[PDB]
Write a protein that binds this ligand. Structure first.
Ligand SMILES: Nc1ncnc2c1ncn2[C@@H]1O[C@H](COP(=O)(O)OS(=O)(=O)O)[C@@H](O)[C@H]1O
Ligand SMILES: Nc1ncnc2c1ncn2[C@@H]1O[C@H](COP(=O)(O)OS(=O)(=O)O)[C@@H](O)[C@H]1O
Ligand SMILES: [Cl-]
Ligand SMILES: [Cl-]
Ligand SMILES: [Cl-]
Ligand SMILES: [Cl-]
Ligand SMILES: [Cl-]
Ligand code: NA
Ligand code: NA
Ligand code: NA
Ligand code: NA
Ligand SMILES: [Zn+2]
Ligand SMILES: [Zn+2]
Lengths: 346, 343
């Protein structure tokens, strides 16, 4: 029998994203050269833009090498086949600094990386036992087909790892105003502890879409891959992957993909300035909040400096704090109708 | 002394717009082939896209002809020189049906056209006595400079002929999210009776901009030309002109440059689909209204069909004709702007 190696969920999700073209142009778990150039130069050796290393890691060096075909185990059964193209070890700390901007294990993304081990295997993979998908978890080809069918030419994608608050909804509405349709694409893979569980994200968005948005033009599908919380660099990753799903536009608000306040609020806007056109337009929007003077939800690009004093910040951190405290998040933060859904997963 | 011809206010304004490049590629008052190609095939004979015929009309055929230099007179002096390159007569009715989509004198646009005379002259123009322009009445070149002065590379232009209402501000808001800056370019030329006077809109806007908008990123200048109310075609006109003022984007809402219910609310939207890339991006936005369920001013593209029966349409007509001593609801007009709307 073939040499076998157990693999976690992050791995099973990402080998599938590789095989489905979600991570195109990356086609297989990266070689050391690929990992390093991606991490330090934001390019693949061949020249294409890419910022997030896709790796198959292990805590103990595997008993396999170039040319071997290995069975990948998950959930007890053999799920896929790996065509090892290289076996190497990485200096995770150096890698984390380049990808996350810090090597502190206090960073959730950094911790997840370290936990997987320094031994890596590169190579293409073939899916044997596809993981069961729900109607929401559509493949890039299924999404692009969905767009063609409905005749959507201009499509703005919206990334998210949380339940929606009024600020998130503003981005979605901005998208609705500029495109034939908007793709709300929640991350379905592993997240840090204080993010809302996928089940409440799914119920919250379906309610927001069903009762407050044109159901007609809001495609709600899920992207199954972990959050890296790498801010600016993850933003580029998010945009590129959405491009593979058929999006022509990608929203990037305040502190896109950040953890706490480690990255500068708009570094994810700026990073695109230091990169070549990507084949998908970036729609940047500043901080979104509530303004009594303006008369409701607004942003820094539409609200006068003189209004500051009266602005009310909108963030899920505040929202969860309010809920964990027994208090009810105000109407200017979250919609009252979604509250029961949120209290349920806090 | 050279031949003298009198000209109306409208004429004085466009002759300058022609010289300031505000109507590029339109050089000077077009010929007969030019007037027909534009009005029927939305193109200059050359090939450039253009929809509104720029004409110098007279109720009585001028005694001048090709090759002649004519002196134009506005008040009581020689405002500019005209190099007549052709003289002719036009079938105003057949010209109107093409331009405004009708020839019914009930149309504020066809009317003004008729009262100008079926006789017209063509040819380049040279200004000799530039009419006094306030700080707002900036020329195309003066506006392009104002943009580089602030480094605005992406500019969204907004066309308006009335006072600011919530739906108007909405479109300006949208522009502020898409570009480094937004150009609010009110029409300073002649408008029909019901449209708010330049004076009031000018004072209402800078009050809005000052107390409710990024004072720093909202350019408020006026375009000195008359309103044609040509609906869709005037929309293309507005687009191309604002392009010359340096805007990269142009906003077009519901029933843009329309009158009563003459044109289909979205005709000014579809017309761009039948034209080639203009060199300026058209930002289409549907009906804008108030919605309690959405929680404020939303649009046909952001408010679901199921909220319809709760929407509160926004129109400057109702407002204007409602101070009947009434008071426009907050969800349609900013209260802080009534003292200006009333006066
Ligand atoms: N208050 C806010 N103002 C503006 N943009 C925001 C705000 N909160 C979140 N966003 C943006 O909206 C999307 C929502 O992201 P979240 O789900 O909160 O977290 S993230 O990891 O996907 O960025 C991202 O583009 C993010 O930058
Ligand atoms: N209620 C509304 N909903 C959507 N767009 C609107 C609304 N009112 C005005 N607009 C649009 O905003 C601009 C304001 O136009 P108006 O001054 O009312 O008339 S126009 O003659 O200049 O077009 C135009 O782009 C117009 O189509
Ligand atoms: Cl329903
Ligand atoms: Cl965030
Ligand atoms: Cl956080
Ligand atoms: Cl960088
Ligand atoms: Cl709203
Ligand atoms: Na380490
Ligand atoms: Na940290
Ligand atoms: Na007539
Ligand atoms: Na519908
Ligand atoms: Zn404000
Ligand atoms: Zn609504």
């Amino acid at each position: 029998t073939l040499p076998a190696l157990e693999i976690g969920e992050d791995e099973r999700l990402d080998l599938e994203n590789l095989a489905t073209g979600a991570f195109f142009p990356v086609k297989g778990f990266m070689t050391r050269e690929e990992a390093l150039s991606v991490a330090h130069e934001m390019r693949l050796p061949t020249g294409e833009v890419w910022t997030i290393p896709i790796l198959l890691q292990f805590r103990e060096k595997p008993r396999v090498g170039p040319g071997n075909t290995v069975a990948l185990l998950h959930g007890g059964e053999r799920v896929a086949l790996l065509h090892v193209a290289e076996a190497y070890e990485l200096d995770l700390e150096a890698l984390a600094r380049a990808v996350f901007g810090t090597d502190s294990e206090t960073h959730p993304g950094v911790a997840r990386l370290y936990g997987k081990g320094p031994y890596a295997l590169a190579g293409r993979v073939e899916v044997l036992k596809p993981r069961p998908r729900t109607p929401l978890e559509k493949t890039p080809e299924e999404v692009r087909a969905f767009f063609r069918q409905r005749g959507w030419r201009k499509v703005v994608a919206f990334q998210t790892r949380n339940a929606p608050h009024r600020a998130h909804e503003y981005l979605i509405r901005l998208g609705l105003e500029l495109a034939d349709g908007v793709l709300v694409h929640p991350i379905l893979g592993a997240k840090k502890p204080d993010d809302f569980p996928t089940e409440v994200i799914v119920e919250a968005y379906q309610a927001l879409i069903r009762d407050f948005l044109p159901q007609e033009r809001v495609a709600f599908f899920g992207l199954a891959t972990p959050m890296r919380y790498a801010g600016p660099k993850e933003a580029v990753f998010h945009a590129l992957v959405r491009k593979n799903f058929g999006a022509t536009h990608f929203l990037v608000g305040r502190d896109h993909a950040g953890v706490g306040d480690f990255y500068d609020p708009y570094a994810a806007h700026r990073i695109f300035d230091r990169l070549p056109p990507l084949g998908i337009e970036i729609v940047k929007v500043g901080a979104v909040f509530h303004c009594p003077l303006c008369g409701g939800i607004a942003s820094e690009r539409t609200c006068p400096e003189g209004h500051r004093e009266k602005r009310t910040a909108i963030s899920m951190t505040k929202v969860r704090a309010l809920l964990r405290e027994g208090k009810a998040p105000p109407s200017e933060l979250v919609r009252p109708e979604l509250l029961p859904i949120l209290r349920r997963g806090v």
